[PDB]
Design a protein around this ligand. Structure first.
Ligand SMILES: O=C(O)C1=C[C@H](O)[C@H](O)[C@H](O[C@H]2[C@H](O)[C@H](O)[C@H](O[C@H]3[C@H](O)[C@H](O)[C@H](O)O[C@@H]3C(=O)O)O[C@@H]2C(=O)O)O1
Length: 351
């Protein structure tokens, strides 16, 4: 690819994106404050519950509107996207339960679900020019994050785990083989493809994929403005602040994942700008929305900046590592986001 980390190697395929053993221990012995307590997943008998089935044949995400970008809604849209969002929610929940309890039963449930999708060759047949391309990057990563926490679990069908891992590896290699257009080549989608390749590169011990993934993080650092804003996200009008925050989600996971492999991505800078510059801009723009006026004149949609929104999951990981202050008071209720490993409060928050 040609970047400072084009020779990086996958050191340990079972390292995951957090220290599972150590975190489980803290959750089982330590004294959890009210916030952490509220984040504990509720146990359930997953062995007798069926999960979403994969679409058969070609993967097609219907258009949201019968025609154009607005107006009459397409009734086929809701049922199809829900199928994927349920798949992602269940995958992340089982991953989080396995971390918190350590019970092999949750790993068995996850594998049974994923084996169903692998056998059907899901997330592989689609038009790369359609919405399906984006749906794949989110769903493959979500399942990969959950599975990465149980790569060292001995009490599970090992042949089944191998089949699933090969499947995810195929899914990621195919999805990232497409370049994307003038924006999707290099905006937050590039970073989502980045976290997908990184976590799957690690569990499938595929150094080439792992390297390609780290390369998206590098690409992003060079697309940061003097004030910490992302070049491509500041072109989204009333959604500019939303996308600035959104891009922080996958970039944070690539860095957290790389860190468990002995690589310090967070320390990587380009022209006096790094990921911290981006974090500081998000916090400053939420306090003073006038800063966005240099890029867009429209009033900003701030739906993502409410306590409890999954969009804030990246703050739990970064705060746990760097210890900066919660300036905006966002970290009150627990946060859960399937696409960035489930509950960051459960997996990283340390009172
Ligand atoms: O995370 C929440 O707590 C949150 C609560 C809400 O009431 C909604 O259910 C909200 O939905 C999210 C959803 O979880 C995804 O994050 C979705 O992601 C979209 C991105 O925001 C971009 O628009 C991207 O281009 O498309 C993504 C997609 O289509 O999945 O955003 C919604 C939302 O913000 O409404 O979650």
């Amino acid at each position: 690819g040609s970047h400072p980390f084009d020779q990086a190697v996958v050191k340990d395929p079972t390292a995951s994106y957090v220290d599972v053993k150590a975190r489980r221990t803290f959750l089982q012995s330590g004294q959890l404050d009210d916030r952490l307590k509220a984040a504990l997943p509720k146990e359930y008998d997953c062995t007798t519950e069926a999960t979403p089935n994969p679409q058969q044949g070609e993967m097609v995400i219907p258009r949201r509107y019968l025609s154009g970008n607005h107006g009459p809604v397409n009734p086929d849209y809701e049922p199809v996207v829900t199928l994927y969002r349920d798949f992602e929610k269940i995958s992340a929940t089982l991953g989080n339960l396995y971390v918190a309890t350590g019970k092999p039963v949750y790993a068995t449930c996850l594998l049974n679900m994923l084996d169903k999708w692998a056998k059907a060759d899901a997330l592989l047949n689609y038009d790369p020019k359609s919405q399906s391309w984006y749906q794949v990057e989110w769903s493959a990563a979500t399942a990969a994050f959950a599975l990465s926490t149980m790569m060292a679990e001995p009490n599970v069908d090992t042949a089944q785990r191998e089949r699933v891992v090969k499947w995810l590896n195929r899914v990621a290699r195919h999805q990232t083989s497409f370049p994307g257009g003038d924006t999707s080549c290099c905006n937050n989608h590039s970073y989502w493809r980045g976290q997908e390749a990184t976590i799957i590169g690690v569990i499938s011990k595929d150094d080439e994929l792992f390297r390609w993934g780290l390369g998206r993080y590098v690409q992003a650092m060079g697309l940061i403005n003097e004030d910490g804003s992302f070049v491509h996200e500041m072109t989204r009008h009333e959604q500019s602040l939303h996308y600035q925050n959104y891009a922080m989600l996958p970039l944070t996971m690539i860095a957290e994942t790389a860190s468990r492999q002995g690589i310090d991505l967070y320390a990587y800078k380009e022209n006096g700008r790094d990921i911290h510059s981006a974090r500081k801009f998000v916090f400053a723009a939420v306090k003073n929305p006038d800063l966005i006026k240099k890029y867009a004149s429209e009033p900003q949609d701030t739906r993502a900046f409410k306590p409890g929104r999954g969009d804030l999951n990246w703050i739990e990981y970064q705060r746990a590592r760097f210890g900066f202050a919660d300036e905006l008071g966002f970290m009150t209720v627990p946060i859960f986001d399937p696409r960035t490993g489930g509950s960051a409060t459960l997996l990283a928050y340390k009172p």
